[PDB]
Amino acid sequence: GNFNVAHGLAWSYYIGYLRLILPELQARIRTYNQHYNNLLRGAVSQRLYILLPLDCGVPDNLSMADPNIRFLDKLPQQTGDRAGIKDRVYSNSIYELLENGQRAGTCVLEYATPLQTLFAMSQYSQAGFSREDRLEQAKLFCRTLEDILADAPESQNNCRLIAYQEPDSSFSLSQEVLRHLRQEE
Amino acid sequence: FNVAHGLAWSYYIGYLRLILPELQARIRTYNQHYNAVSQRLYILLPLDCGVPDNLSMADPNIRFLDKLPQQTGDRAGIKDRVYSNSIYELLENGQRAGTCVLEYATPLQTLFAMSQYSQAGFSREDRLEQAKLFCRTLEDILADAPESQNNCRLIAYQEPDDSSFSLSQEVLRHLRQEE
Numbered sequence: 105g106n107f108n109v110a111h112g113l114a115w116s117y118y119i120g121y122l123r124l125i126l127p128e129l130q131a132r133i134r135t136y137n138q139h140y141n142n143l144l145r146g147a148v149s150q151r152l153y154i155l156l157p158l159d160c161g162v163p164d165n166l167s168m169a170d171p172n173i174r175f176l177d178k179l180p181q182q183t184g185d186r187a188g189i190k191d192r193v194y195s196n197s198i199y200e201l202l203e204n205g206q207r208a209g210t211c212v213l214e215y216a217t218p219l220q221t222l223f224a225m226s227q228y229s230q231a232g233f234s235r236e237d238r239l240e241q242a243k244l245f246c247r248t249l250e251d252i253l254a255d256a257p258e259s260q261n262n263c264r265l266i267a268y269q270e271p272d273s274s275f276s277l278s279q280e281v282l283r284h285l286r287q288e289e
Numbered sequence: 290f291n292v293a294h295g296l297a298w299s300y301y302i303g304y305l306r307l308i309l310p311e312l313q314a315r316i317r318t319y320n321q322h323y324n325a326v327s328q329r330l331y332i333l334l335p336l337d338c339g340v341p342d343n344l345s346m347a348d349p350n351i352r353f354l355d356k357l358p359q360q361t362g363d364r365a366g367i368k369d370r371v372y373s374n375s376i377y378e379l380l381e382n383g384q385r386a387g388t389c390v391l392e393y394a395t396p397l398q399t400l401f402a403m404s405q406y407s408q409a410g411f412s413r414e415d416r417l418e419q420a421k422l423f424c425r426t427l428e429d430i431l432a433d434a435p436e437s438q439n440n441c442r443l444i445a446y447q448e449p450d451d452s453s454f455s456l457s458q459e460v461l462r463h464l465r466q467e468e
């Protein structure tokens with residue numbers, strides 16, 4: 105039950121998003137860094153950072169949560185004709201991570217959108233899922249996504265999953281991403 | 290408590306509930322002096338999960354006419370995330386017989402891809418059952434969201450090398466019945 109739901113969303117996240125964008129991402133980041141960002145310490149990192157809040161709380165504005173996360177720019181758009189929709193575009197947003205009034209990191213950052221479906225399905229009676237089902241579904245989504253990416257040809261050190269339990273006044277989202285960014289080289 | 294339920298709720302929560310409230314107004318912004326499209330989104334639900342990215346590949350009598358004005362929304366850390374819809378003309382005897390906003394349900398293409406990947410654990414018999422569950426679940430969601438139900442028509446069909454079936458003729462039947 106909680107397995108089959110998470111399993112389906114994780115695969116849909118891969119087939120309809122990650123497998124299509126991850127192959128070209130490093131070229132899009134490289135082009136951006138070469139032409140638009142000649143800051144020797146302000147380079148966009150080479151990986152998509154995907155935020156997996158395990159409570160499934162996904163704000164549509166990622167900057168609002170944390171004064172130390174500021175929207176910088178959009179990467180160059182990627183467009184595809186998909187199921188009779190001409191030029192279905194994929195956009196990715198670059199964010200500035202601030203630490204002690206200084207820029208500490210710059211990366212392509214987003215939430216995993218499917219967690220918003222797990223939240224909704226816990227809220228609507230017709231879906232038939234409790235809040236304890238949603239936590240199990242969030243965990244199994246993360247584990248299934250990690251398992252897909254481990255054997256995926258399009259995952260070439262170009263994707264990092266960031267999972268955390270904090271929904272909070274003692275939690276810094278910028279600090280959470282900065283710890284992952286700094287661990288890599 | 291299955292794959293189709295998650296795909297159905299994702300289709301509603303992540304697409305239909307956000308574009309259908311604005312669709313009729315986007316039409317107007319297309320319906321200009323030089324521009325007779327119906328004000329409903331036509332969603333094709335092929336149970337075989339055979340979803341061509343180009344609708345003209347399925348039936349040569351469906352031809353791309355134009356894109357409707359792009360819808361943008363800030364979504365889950367992505368600002369200016371665009372939602373795009375295509376207008377198609379339906380030919381009858383080489384001449385336009387109808388125009389509508391037409392597309393396949395994208396999640397059925399995921400069920401198809403999932404049936405191709407060994408790691409997904411999904412047989413071809415599992416895919417048909419989940420295709421059917423996807424359609425049934427989406428319909429029950431929209432039957433409790435009439436703000437969305439009056440703005441889209443769901444067309445679920447099974448195509449057994451069956452030359453007796455014309456997708457253009459089937460959509461034209463629904464368009465003329467509506468009117």
Ligand SMILES: Nc1nc2c(ncn2[C@@H]2O[C@@H]3COP(=O)(O)O[C@H]4[C@@H](O)[C@H](n5cc(-c6ccc(-c7ccccc7)cc6)c6c(N)ncnc65)O[C@@H]4COP(=O)(O)O[C@@H]2[C@@H]3O)c(=O)[nH]1
Nearest residue numbers: 116117120121217299303304364365367370371372395396
């Ligand atoms: N982060 C990011 N995730 C993406 C993007 N694409 C796709 N996924 C995610 O990959 C999984 C599989 O995608 P599918 O294609 O299989 O199923 C879709 C499709 O049927 C229909 N649908 C959805 C969109 C759409 C989806 C997400 C975004 C978005 C953009 C930025 C941040 C957050 C979300 C924008 C649009 C869509 C569209 N723009 N035009 C026509 N139809 C569409 O609704 C279904 C559920 O959508 P979902 O729950 O939002 O997220 C989907 C889904 O979880 C992307 O560009 N960005």
